[PDB]
Design a protein around this nucleic acid. Structure first.
Lengths: 95, 12, 79, 106, 107, 92, 92, 107, 98, 87
DNA sequence: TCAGGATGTATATATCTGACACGTGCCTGGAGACTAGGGAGTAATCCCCTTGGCGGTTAAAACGCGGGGGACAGCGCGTACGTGCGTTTAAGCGGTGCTAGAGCTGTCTACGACCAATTGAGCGGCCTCGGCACCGGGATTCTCGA
DNA sequence: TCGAGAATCCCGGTGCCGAGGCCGCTCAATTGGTCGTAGACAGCTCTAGCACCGCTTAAACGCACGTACGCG
């Protein structure tokens, strides 16, 4: 076994090093279509349209986590909490 | 005139 | 539920890329909420452009335009 | 001469600054520091300004002659340097202007 | 009637003529000055070249001989001014810069 | 047919790192990069003309637009390059 | 002459709160407000038409631009109002 | 040949004619549809009415009879939806809304 | 002994007072000198309309006030009521100003 | 002093400790650490440098020497901080 | 603090492919030559607004100074999170099969630019008065203590 | 838990100067014709997008345990 956090750091290195998408594509697609249903039915998507949505979405969330992390460590904690996400959004003005 | 060497800087 | 289609480990991976070391369990649900909102905004704009053009297929360009509208210019998908 | 020539060429300072240095170089604080870093009551205070060597030609014999003198100025160091010139030469004086209050005016 | 392109006249690698047309087709103004698209094309080239240089450097660092999106990301994100220029830009397949906070790292 | 800057970007690459090639994804990124910059500059130049109640975009407007777009040294060098290009262009 | 919307803003005020007046400072704010909105809508409509390779801005583009500019119900009412106004206009 | 304004034909308070000219002066497109300035003017009026309505209410609440910048600020910021619309706007002399965090208050 | 309010009572009064009012908080002539000096680093011999300066100050104070709002929030997040440079720096870093 | 005024401090120091405090009070800050005052000045200085640089660039472009309110407005508008009330 | 070991990472070697570099034919979009006209440059006036300094008051900034309240370091508790293992399940990747819609081309016309003749809507200038700022004063509450 | 000094709110008189209105003036918005052409529309094509399933397998999940960091 490893001391908790050792592997976490390995994973951080691993994911920052690589560049592929992190969210399962088909689950993502279904999410998109579901949301789209509320604006207009019978819509289609180019496969590249979904790809654009996914990658932009992941880029967004990664950036969010970066800022969230900063808030957590501002409070001298290493565990991020919902209130750190909320803070980050509030500071950015996304609220 | 004399000390033009430092006066050459103060003019800046 | 498709929002639950974004799994716990998927979120963890995103957080790892973001440099997050330790993650509270509450984060996973909170993250889903945030993503949902983000997509609703982008998709709403993209759909609007599609409707404007009298088409039925949302194109990549419509997505790109939506993102440009929101100040999140996306390179590589044309535009 | 050099301040005039240099500022003449450097460029409302074309009227004002040239007046200021004609009145006395050290009204510009930085040149005071450059010419005399100690900022004390040195003879350079006279050497750098023709108008006060004139006063060295006048105020000594003038006082010696038993006479009194009034004089009019631009504000700031233009007057404050006189206080120094007068103290360097032990020429007792008073000083009155807009910054003083009616009690001491009287 | 010897022809010579404006790009070749200016000594630029970008299609000055195309740029000129784009300025007119994009309705940026009523009139487009003759020296406008030339000046602009030069700028476009300048910026393009600087990024490509840095991207190539990134490729060399990774022992690659071909620029990929990751290299472009590295190039832009590392250079201060390019980062500012493209501060609101998401580059597809770029990823993020290697960066672990010292507070998370072990003592 | 659909135009792009692919071949121009490519030529520039060849003029900087002759040996280095470029993936099609990287190329599409560079293509959208060029379009982005083009638009930002043109957009600013456009409103500069409006701000001065003019109607012609010239190298002066573009130059200013560059100064109002690029940060620090990028602006300094871009302006320098633009100047040279126009200079040579009109000189010959 | 330096045209503005002061008189129109003024008239609107008197149709909402007939007794309420407005300071000249507040009026200049409202004036710049109108200009801001005008530009935003027109700007979106401009590039919107451009996106479809069209050269004419019509009420369709203005409508869409509103939908792409104003938030929530505000947009819904603006669209409703615009629609109504045009309807009456074309009738008359 | 009785003249009648386009705004009166539309039933609007905003100068449809002026709006039309502005669209053509701003070079927003090559051509401007006849109904475009009509539709637009109506929207401009609508939004104008929304702010003034709220601003007047603010004046009433402050026992004032004229709208001042402060009222405009209060009107916009209280109305969340307008607040989103003008989220990046600074209103001269508007001030800020009264707001003390409960954590800062005494027991 | 003379009357003294418990520390913070006055603070809250000031907060109410300044949020209620709308006037400028920075001395105008000091503000102008600051502006003029900065301007000299881009081009000398510039003149300003007095309203130009006012535009700068309205924006400047709006900016700093907004910054303090976010700064305050950060301090609260960290269970403090005293704002610190760390909170300012964080706020700007989160906003993307640095 | 009397002999020499020696009152040249700094223009950034024109933003006083209480001036900053007041801004913070409007912001809603209850208590302010002593290092804030210096940090605030630094931030403001930067803010103004950016706005002023844009404003004078517009002025230079127009070939004028007086920076106008509209030039300031354009600078602010450029940076995403639209200012109402100055035309 | 040090050696062993398990894991993981890294590194040389085939090998294999599909994505990039490159050759070729076409064609339309860019260059050349030429003409008009109006936008922009440029000179001359003028006068309003900016700037530099001073005079004089006074609210405010600075400064010292006591002292209490918050920041913070330490320390214990316990619970929520990481880590690992076995099990499930749903994604990824290959098929079929249908057709809706994107896209292209050809008509054809309502419809918006363009131009001139006309006039009142809006704008600058200039009265005019009450809405709101401002002070005098007295009731009222708001935050301390014995 | 009730008093005391200070901040605040309300009321009343003053008064003044910026908003509201009137008025003449012009130029920009009308009206009325033309006229070239951008867009509407019909029609045709054909391909990419959607729906479903078969099959493999790598990730997701559930459980359980220690312990480290959150928190008081």
């Amino acid at each position: 076994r490893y001391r908790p956090g050792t592997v976490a750091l390995r994973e951080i290195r691993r994911y920052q090093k690589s560049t592929e998408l992190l969210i399962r594509k088909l689950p993502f697609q279904r999410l998109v279509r579901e949301i789209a249903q509320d604006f207009k039915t019978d819509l289609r998507f180019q496969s590249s349209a979904v790809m654009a949505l996914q990658e932009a979405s992941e880029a967004y969330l990664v950036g969010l986590f970066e800022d969230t992390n900063l808030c957590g460590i501002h409070a001298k904690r290493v565990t991020i909490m919902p209130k750190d996400i909320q803070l980050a959004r509030r500071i950015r003005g996304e609220r | 005139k004399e000390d033009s060497e430092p006066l050459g800087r103060i003019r800046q | 539920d498709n929002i639950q289609g974004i799994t716990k480990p998927a979120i963890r991976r995103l957080a790892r890329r973001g440099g997050v070391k330790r993650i509270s369990g509450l984060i996973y649900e909170e993250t889903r909420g945030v993503l949902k909102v983000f997509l609703e905004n982008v998709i709403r704009d993209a759909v609007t452009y599609t409707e404007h053009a009298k088409r039925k297929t949302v194109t990549a360009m419509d997505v790109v335009y939506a993102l440009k509208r929101q100040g999140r210019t996306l390179y590589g998908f044309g535009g | 001469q050099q301040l005039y020539q240099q500022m003449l060429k450097h460029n409302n300072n074309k009227i004002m600054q040239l007046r200021k240095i004609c009145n006395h170089p050290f009204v510009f604080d930085e040149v005071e520091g450059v010419v005399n870093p100690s900022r004390g009551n040195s003879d350079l205070l006279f050497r750098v300004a023709g108008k006060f060597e004139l006063l060295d030609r006048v105020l000594p014999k003038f006082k010696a002659s038993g006479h009194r003198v009034l004089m009019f100025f631009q504000m700031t160091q233009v007057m404050d340097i006189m206080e120094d010139f007068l103290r360097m030469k032990d020429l007792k004086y008073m000083r009155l202007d807009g910054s003083t209050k009616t009690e001491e005016r009287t | 009637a010897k022809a010579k392109t404006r790009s070749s006249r200016a000594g630029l690698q970008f299609p000055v003529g195309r740029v000129h047309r784009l300025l007119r087709k994009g309705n940026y103004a009523e009139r487009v000055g003759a020296g406008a698209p030339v000046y602009l094309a030069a700028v476009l080239e300048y910026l393009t070249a600087e990024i490509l240089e840095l991207a190539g450097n990134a490729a060399r660092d990774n022992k690659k001989t071909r620029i990929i999106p990751r290299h472009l990301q590295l190039a832009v994100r590392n250079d201060e001014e390019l980062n500012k220029l493209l501060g609101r830009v998401t580059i597809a397949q770029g990823g993020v810069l290697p960066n672990i906070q010292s507070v998370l790292l072990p003592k | 047919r659909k135009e792009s800057y692919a071949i121009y970007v490519y030529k520039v690459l060849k003029q900087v790192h002759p040996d280095t090639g470029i993936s099609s994804k990287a190329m599409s990124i560079m293509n959208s990069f060029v379009n982005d910059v083009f638009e930002r500059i043109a957009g600013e130049a456009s409103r500069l003309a409006h701000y001065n109640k003019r109607s012609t975009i010239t190298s002066r407007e573009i130059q200013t637009a560059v100064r109002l777009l690029l940060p620090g040294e990028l602006a300094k060098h871009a302006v320098s390059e633009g100047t040279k290009a126009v200079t040579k262009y009109t000189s010959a």
